[PDB]
Amino acid sequence: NVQIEKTGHQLEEQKKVLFQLDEQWKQVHGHLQVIKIQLHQEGRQLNLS
Amino acid sequence: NVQIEKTGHQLEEQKKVLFQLDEQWKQVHGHLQVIKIQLHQEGRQLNLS
């Protein structure tokens, strides 16, 4: 039981950390998606990757 | 005791975050200095700021 409670507390901590990391990850992902959208819009005409 | 355990976990998490941030800070500073020295070397040949 002691190990179970200790692991439960650790799990809550890591859940918090994971949520904040995903917040940051999705911010960066949104920025990158917008930038790729713009690049493809302005780079549409060219036959170039 | 419960609060002590919880805050010890929190302190360790923040310590991990601080260490990671200082690592990225060191890396960025190294790259910044490399870029600065290269810029000065390649710009000194011309009488420009």
Side-chain angles (χ1 to χ4, degrees):
Chain A
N1 182 83
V2 162
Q3 282 185 54
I4 280 179
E5 273 182 39
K6 204 179 289 279
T7 298
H9 284 72
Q10 277 204 22
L11 175 57
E12 284 298 312
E13 291 311 305
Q14 302 313 323
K15 281 261 193 46
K16 281 186 170 189
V17 172
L18 176 68
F19 180 82
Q20 291 195 336
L21 262 204
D22 262 7
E23 165 185 288
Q24 284 163 89
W25 180 66
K26 281 180 174 177
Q27 276 190 6
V28 154
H29 183 81
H31 288 170
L32 176 54
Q33 182 58 19
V34 165
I35 287 296
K36 275 179 176 180
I37 279 167
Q38 286 195 14
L39 175 89
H40 207 82
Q41 280 195 266
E42 295 191 0
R44 186 172 186 153
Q45 289 72 6
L46 317 191
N47 180 32
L48 301 169
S49 295
Chain B
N1 186 81
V2 157
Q3 287 176 7
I4 282 169
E5 192 88 313
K6 194 75 156 169
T7 304
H9 281 307
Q10 285 196 3
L11 180 73
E12 293 311 321
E13 178 211 311
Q14 300 317 322
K15 187 173 174 186
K16 280 183 177 185
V17 172
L18 183 67
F19 166 65
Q20 169 271 8
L21 275 185
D22 277 2
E23 246 300 313
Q24 284 185 12
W25 180 96
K26 285 158 60 71
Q27 299 152 27
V28 158
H29 198 66
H31 283 189
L32 173 62
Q33 293 302 351
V34 165
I35 292 298
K36 269 182 164 184
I37 81 184
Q38 287 172 8
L39 165 69
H40 196 274
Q41 280 184 34
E42 296 177 21
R44 51 155 175 73
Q45 301 176 3
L46 301 318
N47 190 34
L48 281 309
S49 70

